[PDB]
């Protein structure tokens, strides 16, 4: 029970199975003893014993990943119940050590044989609640494991589905999705070719992208062109798209992993795209409600549409995030935005000061009105972006008399422009420049980690795009009254034994290489030479002092 | 720059569509709507931010519904395009300059050979007068001392061969002498000799006879 609580919601340890429950309720040996000994050493926080038990037996990498997850969960539980706060550091160090061991073992296995390395990451683990190494590594939030070359190659092979399209893809997928006769000219891995072509994640992604582009074009057409009292066909298509997308979001929030409905919404509202999509759908619904009414309400609904189109235009960054070079740039923008806000507060302060000074100096006969609130922000803000217009600030003053102190406005403006356009923007450039390498590397690692989540969330979605997704939901109603690949890879006993022997060979070679590399370092050689020289000097002094003559 | 201009184009299209749809709600479907999105939002960021043609000052025609959103959308758009993306592009150009410079220098030095060789074959007359050279090639149609190679006699060839043998011998000797004087090799040899000496001394001490 405590193992199942530590691991996750979907995990099911062998102890709580009904076979072991019936075998224990009337109170035999274990097939793999070192699994239970390793779990015992991990739970009771005995690091040396756990490291000794790790290198004996089979399924070494799965054991390392399970140990890393258990240590991370134990550290999280320890730094919650007001503990001594030093147990958490030791548990985190143990988790990091186990993760590093898993990464090094994967590196050795990939270096020795590539196909067997990819084989080792996919086969179903019978002793570990029917999970793969990828699922354990993802559930442990191990960014250095997914970002490895072998994991990325495996993710690419799962993303491409049964097709190959190795040298040049993308265009062929679009041709297939637009020209169904062109499907037959594509090679497949070892009537049925249509089903295997359309069930790949990548063709689902391109179908969804084409549907989104079409919906966006319809939205642009319906907001650009004059609208009548009742909606046109393009507006009906847009409304249908929004409604079906909302239905799909509800279906996703209902079929989530947690069993509690209140827990499902709380875990769904974690990504910012989900909450922003919910807000946008509610806003579009409000605008559509106000649209089908009299003239002022219709105008307000149209303005709601024109505001809402901005978000759906921005949401193209999610589509762009698939590309290898347009995802890290988006994340880099996401962090530099926080830096920009921190540096824009000061610009706002200086702008407010200059605007209030100029407005107070120039116009001393203004009644209290809200126009004074915009005369401060408007023109001092457009000034710095390339609209420095004389005679609009410090006007020439047949000629009306000059206001008292009107000569000070250009003196203030010169210093304001010098501060805003030469000091703060250059300092912001320096800040963006000197904090780019860390942000780039972190963004690359995070994107390579989230590739797995993208692949799974496209492998789970129905094959039809959101404008046609209603037909797929009707099918799910018919199936309501009624994984060979994509996640795992089942095998026989002989292939399992071959994989086990390969893994034992890999771990043995890894330990032997580590020992041979440690024993040949300069520091070890110097230490051993010093000790032997000291002992030899003592022996030689004893020999010289003790002679028969 | 193209990889970074895709995003600028997305944001520009968004702002242009929003402003054009807000301001003018009585436009027939015409191709003029296709350029009203790209034209002015593109000239705005290069120094045409004129504050009288984005939010018109409106004897006075009535104010269009929601015409106060255009300045806010434009302020956010200018802040994104002129402060965030261009500075990030500057950072990208700055932090990927050394590798590009070194690779370009190496590639130019390599292509110098092709540049030199392609002028050693072209006819001496320039393209406006190259017709005369082609006529000459017609006359020569019915009919490399230097520039590429350098033919030499047997004694010069033997001198070059002896020089090359001396060079390769000196190279191998220098490589071996440099390897044998490294710190790692000295430490390894000293450790092995110390181990053997310790074993020998223990065997000598165990070989007492009195
Ligand atoms: C905000 C919801 C209401 C939307 C309806 C009205 C929209 C009117 C204003 C448009 C604002 C839309 C921007 C919201 C996008 C943020 C999404 C997000 O936070 O995901 C986190 C997202 C990922 O988190 P993850 O779920 O863990 O993957 O992080 C990002 O990478 C977002 C970076 C892209 C944002 C740059 C552009 C923002 C400036 C746009 C200003 C408007 C210009 C108009 C001219
Ligand atoms: C208007 C905006 C619409 C949304 C924009 C569409 C969204 C968008 O911009 O990216 C989508 C698409 C995703 O496909 P993705 O990148 O995953 O697939 C790549 C493709 O297979 C390349 O041929 C591979 O070689 P290369 O390394 O590249 O040399 C590349 O490397 P590898 O993994 O096989 O080793 C593959 O990653 O990215 C494109 O490649 C553009 C293909 C042409 C797309 C044509 C678009 C019409
Ligand atoms: C001059 O008078 C023209 C008239 C013929 C009228 O035909 C119209 C048919 C719709 C059409 C082609 C027209 C104007 C706006 C056009 C929109 C601009 C939008 O821009 C795009 C811009 C970029 C896209 C990313 C978004 O959408 C289109 C969805 C959109 C777009 C191309 C939809 C198509 C619209 C012309 C002459 O006949 C006698
Ligand atoms: C159009 O005619 C208006 C009239 C109602 C008149 O009420 C007035 C009450 C004072 C009030 C709210 C008004 C105009 C200037 C307003 C100032 C602008 C300043 O800005 C702020 C700007 C930002 C702050 C950081 C600094 O101060 C305020 C201290 C300041 C401020 C909000 C104080 C409040 C002033 C309107 C209509 O009657 C139906
Ligand atoms: Na300028």
Pocket test for ligand 2, best of A151, A160, A170 (most atoms within 8 A of CB): A170
CA–centroid distance, A275 to ligand 2, in Å, is 28
For tokens 């050394």, the residue is: B98
Instruction: Judge contact between A116 and A502, C-beta under 8 A.
Output: yes
State whether the beta carbon of A308 lies less than 6 angstroms from ligand 1.
yes
From chain B, pick out residues whose CB is under 8 angstroms from the CB of A432.
87-88, 90-91
A326 to A34, A213, A271, B9, B86: CA distances (angstroms)? 46, 18, 19, 14, 16
**β partners of residue A140:** none
Q: Helix/strand/coil (H, E, C) string of chain B? A: CHHHHHHHHHHHHHHHHHHHHHHCCCCCCCCHHHHCCCHHHHHHCCCCCCCCCCCCCCCCCCCCCCCCHHHHHHHHHHHHHHHHHHHHHHHHHHHCCHHHHHHHHHHHHHHHHHHHHHHCCCCCCCHHHHHHHHHHHHHHHCCCCCCCCCCCCHHHHHHHHHHHHHHHHHHHHHHHHHHHCCHHHHHHHHHHHHHHHHHHHHHHHCCCCC
| Cβ <8 Å between A344 and B83 | yes
Q: Pick the residue from chain B with its C-alpha nearest to A296.
A: B65
Choose among A142, A139, A138, A134: nearest CA to A99: A142
**Which residue from B187, B59, B173 is spatially nearest to A528, judged by alpha carbons?**
B187
B69 CA from centroid of ligand 4 (Å):
20
Neighbours of A134 (CB within 10 A): 21
Place of tokens 């060789």: B117
CA–CA separation, A309 and A216 (whole Å): 8
User: A204 near A463, Cβ under 8 Å?
Assistant: yes
Nearest to A332 by CA among A435, A426, A428: A435
Would the CB of A367 count as within 6 Å of ligand 4? no
On whether the CB atoms of residues A384 and A420 are closer than 8 A, the answer is: yes
Spatial separation of the C-alpha atoms in residues B33 and B26, rounded to whole Å: 12
Measured CA to CA, the distance from residue A420 to residue A399 in angstroms comes to: 33
Helix (H, G, I), strand (E, B) or coil at A188: strand
CA–CA gap between residue A66 and residue A71 (Å, rounded): 9
CA distances from B108 to A307, B33, B113, B118 (A): 52, 47, 9, 15
- Residue pair A39/A65 in contact (Cβ under 8 Å)? The answer is no
The structure was resolved to a resolution in Å of 3.4
Which of B17, B45, B182, B201 should be substituted to probe chain A, the one whose Cβ sees the most A Cβ atoms within 10 Å?
A: B17
- Shortest CA distance to A521 belongs to which of B181, B176, B192, B187? B187
């Amino acid at each position: 029970l405590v193992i199942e609580y530590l691991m996750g919601g979907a995990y099911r340890c062998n102890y709580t199975r009904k076979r072991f429950r019936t075998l224990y309720h009337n109170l035999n040996h274990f097939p793999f003893p070192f699994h239970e000994l390793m779990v015992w050493a991990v739970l009771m926080k005995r690091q040396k014993m756990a490291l000794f038990f790790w290198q004996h037996g089979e399924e070494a990498m799965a054991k390392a990943l399970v140990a890393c997850k258990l240590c991370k969960a134990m550290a999280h539980e320890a730094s919650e119940n007001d503990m001594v706060d030093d147990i958490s550091q030791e548990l985190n160090h143990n988790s990091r050590d186990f993760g590093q061991l898993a990464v090094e073992l994967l590196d050795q296995s990939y270096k020795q044989d590539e196909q067997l390395a990819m084989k080792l990451l996919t086969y179903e683990l019978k002793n570990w609640s029917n999970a793969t190494c990828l699922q354990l590594a993802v559930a442990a939030k191990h960014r250095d494991f997914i970002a490895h070359t072998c994991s990325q190659m495996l993710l690419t092979d799962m993303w491409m589905g049964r097709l190959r399209m190795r040298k040049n893809s993308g265009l062929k997928v679009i041709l297939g999705i637009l020209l169904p006769p062109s499907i037959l000219s594509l090679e497949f891995k070892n009537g049925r070719k249509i089903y295997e072509f359309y069930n790949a994640p990548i063709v689902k992604f391109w179908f969804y992208t084409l549907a989104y582009i079409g919906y966006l074009m319809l939205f642009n057409y319906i907001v650009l062109v004059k609208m009548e009292r009742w909606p046109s066909t393009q507006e009906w298509i847009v409304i249908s798209y929004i409604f079906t997308l909302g239905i799909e979001k509800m279906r996703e929030i209902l079929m989530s992993e947690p069993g509690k409905l209140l827990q499902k919404v709380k875990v769904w509202l974690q990504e910012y795209w989900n909450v922003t999509d919910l807000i946008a759908i509610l806003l579009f619904s409000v605008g559509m409600i106000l649209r089908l009414q009299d003239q002022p309400f219709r105008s307000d609904g149209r303005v709601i549409y024109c505001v809402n189109i901005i978000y759906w235009y921005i949401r193209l960054l999610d589509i762009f995030g698939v590309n290898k070079y347009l995802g890290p740039y988006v994340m880099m923008i996401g962090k530099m935005m926080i830096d920009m806000m921190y540096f824009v507060i000061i610009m706002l302060v200086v702008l407010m000061s200059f605007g209030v000074a100029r407005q107070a100096i120039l116009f001393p006969n203004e009644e209290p009105s809200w126009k004074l609130a915009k005369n401060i922000f408007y023109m001092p803000y457009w000034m710095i972006y390339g609209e420095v217009f004389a005679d609009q600030i410090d006007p020439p003053c047949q000629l009306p008399p000059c206001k008292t102190g009107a000569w000070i406005v250009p003196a203030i403006m010169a210093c304001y422009l010098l501060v805003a356009n030469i000091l703060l923007v250059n300092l912001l450039i320096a800040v963006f420049n000197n904090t780019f390498f860390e942000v780039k590397s972190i963004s690359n690692q995070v994107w390579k980690f989230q590739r797995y989540q993208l692949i799974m969330t496209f492998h789970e979605r129905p094959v039809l795009p959101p404008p046609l997704i209603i037909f797929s939901h009707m099918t799910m109603i018919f199936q309501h009254v009624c994984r060979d690949y994509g996640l795992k890879l089942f095998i026989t006993d002989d292939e399992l034994k071959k994989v086990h022997d390969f893994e034992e060979q890999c771990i043995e070679e890894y330990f032997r290489e580590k020992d041979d590399r440690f024993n040949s370092s300069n520091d070890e050689r110097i230490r051993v030479t010093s000790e032997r020289v000291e002992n030899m000097s003592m022996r030689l002094e004893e020999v010289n002092e003790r002679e028969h003559s």
